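Thread: assembly with ligand

MN 10:42: here's the input set. Chains plus the small molecule as SMILES. Want everything predicted jointly, not piecewise.
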Amino acid sequence: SYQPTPEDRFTFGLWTVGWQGRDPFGDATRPALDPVETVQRLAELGAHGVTFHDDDLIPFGSSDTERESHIKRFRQALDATGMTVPMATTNLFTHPVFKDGGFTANDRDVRRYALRKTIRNIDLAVELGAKTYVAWGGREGAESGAAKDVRVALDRMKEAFDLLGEYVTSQGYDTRFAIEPKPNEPRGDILLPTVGHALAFIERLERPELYGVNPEVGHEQMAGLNFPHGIAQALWAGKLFHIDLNGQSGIKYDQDLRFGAGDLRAAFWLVDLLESAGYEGPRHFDFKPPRTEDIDGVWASAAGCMRNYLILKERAAAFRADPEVQEALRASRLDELAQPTAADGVQELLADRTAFEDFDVDAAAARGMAFERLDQLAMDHLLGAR
Amino acid sequence: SYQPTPEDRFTFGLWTVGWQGRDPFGDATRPALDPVETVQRLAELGAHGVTFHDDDLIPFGSSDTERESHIKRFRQALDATGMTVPMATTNLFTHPVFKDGGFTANDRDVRRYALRKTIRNIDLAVELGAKTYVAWGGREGAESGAAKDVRVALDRMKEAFDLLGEYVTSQGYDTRFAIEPKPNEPRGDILLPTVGHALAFIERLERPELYGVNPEVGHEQMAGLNFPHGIAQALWAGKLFHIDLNGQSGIKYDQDLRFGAGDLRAAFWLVDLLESAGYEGPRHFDFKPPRTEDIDGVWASAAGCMRNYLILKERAAAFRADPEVQEALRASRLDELAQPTAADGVQELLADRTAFEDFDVDAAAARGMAFERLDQLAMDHLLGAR
Amino acid sequence: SYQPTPEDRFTFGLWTVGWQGRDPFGDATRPALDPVETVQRLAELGAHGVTFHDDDLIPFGSSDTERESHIKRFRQALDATGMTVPMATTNLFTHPVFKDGGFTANDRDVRRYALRKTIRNIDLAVELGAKTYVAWGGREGAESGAAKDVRVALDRMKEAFDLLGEYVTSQGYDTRFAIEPKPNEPRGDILLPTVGHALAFIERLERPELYGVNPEVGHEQMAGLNFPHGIAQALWAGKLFHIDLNGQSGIKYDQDLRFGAGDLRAAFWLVDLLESAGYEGPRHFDFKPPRTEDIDGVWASAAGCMRNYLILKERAAAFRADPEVQEALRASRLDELAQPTAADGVQELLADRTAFEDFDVDAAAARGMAFERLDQLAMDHLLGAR
Amino acid sequence: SYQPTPEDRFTFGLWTVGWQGRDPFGDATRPALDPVETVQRLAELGAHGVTFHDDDLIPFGSSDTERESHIKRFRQALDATGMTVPMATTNLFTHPVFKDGGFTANDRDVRRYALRKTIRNIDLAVELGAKTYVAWGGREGAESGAAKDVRVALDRMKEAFDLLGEYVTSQGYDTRFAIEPKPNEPRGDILLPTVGHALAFIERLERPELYGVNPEVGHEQMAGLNFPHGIAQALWAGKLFHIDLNGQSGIKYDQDLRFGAGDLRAAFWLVDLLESAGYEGPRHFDFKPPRTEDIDGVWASAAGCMRNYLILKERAAAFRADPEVQEALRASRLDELAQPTAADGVQELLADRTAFEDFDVDAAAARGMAFERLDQLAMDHLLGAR
Ligand SMILES: CO[C@H](C(=O)CO)[C@H](O)[C@H](O)CO
Ligand SMILES: CO[C@H](C(=O)CO)[C@H](O)[C@H](O)CO
Ligand SMILES: CO[C@H](C(=O)CO)[C@H](O)[C@H](O)CO
Ligand SMILES: CO[C@H](C(=O)CO)[C@H](O)[C@H](O)CO
Ligand SMILES: [Mg+2]
Ligand SMILES: [Mg+2]
Ligand SMILES: [Mg+2]
Ligand SMILES: [Mg+2]
Ligand SMILES: [Mg+2]
Ligand SMILES: [Mg+2]
Ligand SMILES: [Mg+2]
Ligand SMILES: [Mg+2]
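BT 11:07: finished. Tokens for the full assembly:
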């Protein structure tokens, strides 16, 4: 049933199937995976590519000899499978030197080091073929109010992203940045907590065009927000450069369940939106196989991610294609939302008696929107009871 | 103790002390207040001004005769007290014609009417002296996913705000707009749910400079976000045109408690920020006296709003002025966050061996940030145990 | 297909399809429904019965002849359709006199009135054949800490429930009580906020056997709790006397969406539990059709409530009947969970060297739980992908 | 000043100041603390005692001579300082074998091992003079619906607690059990998620009197519940055997901030309740110093825990002692809440015409509760503004 193909553009980070199971209250339940074995098993599952943090490929502290060998094995696995590397990122959160941040650490020397660690991995990403470079500022923030002046930390954050933009422009590299928002965890509150904050920030950068967002399903759901609405605003702004798919069941710690789990109706409305907007980037899964699972449970969770996307794609396409749904969208006046409010400008509007003086407000008030019927047709499609 | 003065710029909406107590499960517990009596009692309490929605001043459905009289009584109360009207807004949410929105209603004729109702009140606000005009799109959103295409609704929302901007520019009016974000209630999800989303949106308008945000304490706390951080990003972007103060105790329905209640530490860090950034606009309270109270409980809740602001102002000023706190900020390296990461550009950074090759990552990793000590000094100041 | 018949025990409150659309920020969008027309329209939809608050059937302040006339015409609608009244309840939250509670109001005279209003409706409910009497204390609680001494409020709440138990026992009525928990709204915090708190409270009443819980889907989800887990504990305790079914999309105000909407996977696991535990009570819908809808959208939403329960009933039955799922459950050792840990007793467990000193901890640690495979079979069944 | 002395019963877990800073996204930022140095540094801070998990004092897999040696040097640190051990607990969550639970693991052999690991530490705790034995089932739960049959898991959980009760009773040990509830983390949902669910469960055990609750501030706040209300119900039930004090800033991952931080007003109302109810147990701090801190920030955070409890103790005592507050409480009729509703009985209440037919409902509806004035007196006392 529903098999992944390379044209579905499913990708996974080395850190997702590679998660060993270490959590705040417990030790690892799985052995470390070799990146080479991960590229091979994912190519067998039907994935199109893999992503990585620098510390997933090259152990922190590796000499340039050991680094070369790691990179070399990895590149041989890719070349043998035809797997691509669409995106890459830096780990600016695991090592204790980043306990107060990377780009917005209060210590200047830590900020400089964070920038050098990042530029080094940007050079590697570009030769491996990555066209999107992701920044998740997991340690940028605070647990207490005087620990961080946020206006000055946004200057430092703007300064870091402007220097990265200056560096790829002078190298003539074809790579764009995507900021990944998260409202909290591991910091009490993280800077640029949602898609909207990250979008507003990009507009204050010296080269706005170089930067977009990499929203994640479970991160906007950790603030109780509607992830399809956030994604529609990122698409409206032209800034959906990448997306991270997974599941989350409410406002609690960051779960990273496989895609489809968590809020199932929101995953349906997200696939419907991505598919009807013709989003063309990777469908990247950033999930963690639960630590209850062994390695077979890992590849079953990874396969379940892609399967759930393909079943929802099919139900959504069937929803939109149904004549009765099309008729119900006309009835709920979704065609009329697409017509301009006042295409002849404000002076026509002002002159129009029917827009105010003679508007029958109670006739209009009494029209039913027919939204429940439309939503129960969407329910029957999702459940295949239509 | 702590008496409000006109220079504190405390303002209140007619709808706040005027709330009759009607809620989703219950009828009104208080009689309607006359606007004239509200201007007089608030001037006696030490408030500086009042704000209003059009339907708070002039009953929906009033003829231009009855409208004139309402406006006339109101203006006499203001002139007699010296009360100002700093801001005004439209009610695009109470009447059943707005059940699916005002500016983003699916029905085109409702959107045109919403625009005419708004322009009419913009003319009144400007003659009363309002310099900020607030838009709270309470009904813009949905309870179900196919009921609203969000990309098209943002076109309609951009179109409405661009027409309002064209109208005040051609009239030569000195009035700016402030968008008030709210994540949900009364709609399942409201469009532009947080400060960040509202900030990002403004940047796509034809005249960005005309528009800023009016954030509300309890609204960003309904998505579990840190309100002082959201306000610091609005100030960093130059867009804090106005602010609404109240309290909220967590992620639940919108409470509108008096300012100081709810998250007390966040109110302290907010006053500290507003006062040290030299914000100069109104300190507006948008709160609801609980329906358990009679009219004396109403003016006690309203007075408590201003009192709590003045006690926190004093504790914050004392925190920042203390030599021991200043020494603790140097120790947590808050002065170093203010220094540029790499003011000699990316090529100096790249050349610098000490930024990477020779950086002693474990010496840096081992420096303690001394944040708990700094936060316990902030705790002793707030509690006056210092 | 999925057509409801009275055999399915689907019931609806008069206040559900009869909600007019008045919310915290808006007026009514629909006309009041006559109880008589609600009884016949629901009988046609396939419903089994209706429930009521005293003030839904008899307008507050009715003279006893008007009271009698209302009951009389209701009773004849019931008799002509074969509709039943399984449950009734009291409105102790709408009138201004209940602004601080009914049974735990600080004013003693109000607490005596609340008990007399309730006893009058217990006599009426027993005459119409109600077997469960629900108590939703929506006004028992507080917005501030010193307003309510909670240990004393629980003494007053125990006092009220013991007096109602004494009353129905002296009348020899065959009726039982079900407490409906809600964490908040309309009070800042409500007493007995979840299923667990209501279950613990019942054990301290004089006649515990007379009382159980009426959990509501959306109420436990407002505290972010797992509603199928909460129902499993109420069933394990033998106290699930009734249930209210609806949808909620996260921690926010109380939405009362139609059942199936909100968290769809929790609706599936709930039906799987009710059906396999053999719950025999009413499947009651306490939902509110959105105020965007006219009277036709009202009956469409009500009909979708029943349709979604019947589609999920079928997918849950198919899931459990599948040999491959049955095999997946043995693989995840759900059969072993049913075996007693130590039926051999404590001294045999203590003498058992294989339970401790010779237990191979690393061999057990390495067994995967196979939970993700199992959950994807559940997902495939829910979506009809098998 | 606010100096802690052993008379204040302040206790700390070895795992609290001993947390190394390893979190879901990062490695340790601090070295392990020796138990012996923790006992003496806390005795100097004014603490009264320490608590431990078996694996905090004796590293997992210690041979019995290494076990004996660890206990021996711990016991001599204790004896030299006069420090006590009021409470102990078992670690049934860290080792990989507990990845599906201890007492409710699907594997039966793991459940027998979990009981043997616990009985071994009950013998040790009683030798060191512990009177309360805490059980925090952090791994009892699930991330998916079919993984755990919750009615059967509660049978296994009852079975485990009844076997521990049989064991301490046959040993004639004077020790009682306290269940610590948490809604989630590290499992998607944890069994017995709140105080109420643990209280209800206890009533179904064989010897209910042997068991109570150990509520934690931050755990109930992760479900958005009012922690002082939850403690008032545990005290009303006579089951508050122990308490864990810390801070949490909302519904998100579990922070374990120092007490006083997070929701400051709930910390004030909590201390007001513990002190006026006369709670006599340990004021235990289960918090984690942020990983931004070195060992000096660790002892500063621990010291702030005790300081904040003593400042709030003083403000709560001053609030209740104030004649003006005492007068405000009569005005809000908190004296009337203490009067029985109907000590005259049901037939006298039924015959009482002033309770219903002659009750003036509109006169009672009009009495304001004066709760906002009262809450602002509380606010003034908390901030030391009076
Ligand atoms: C470990 O996953 C990270 C995340 O989402 C945090 O919740 C990011 O995906 C990573 O930094 C690269 O983007
Ligand atoms: C009734 O208060 C409103 C609000 O905040 C909704 O939660 C706005 O303040 C009003 O529309 C003017 O801004
Ligand atoms: C409006 O419905 C009520 C409720 O749940 C509100 O949250 C109860 O269902 C009713 O009082 C009887 O159960
Ligand atoms: C790390 O501490 C534990 C906990 O609360 C985690 O949420 C318990 O306190 C401990 O197992 C004994 O009570
Ligand atoms: Mg995540
Ligand atoms: Mg991610
Ligand atoms: Mg509000
Ligand atoms: Mg507002
Ligand atoms: Mg509800
Ligand atoms: Mg209900
Ligand atoms: Mg905790
Ligand atoms: Mg604890």
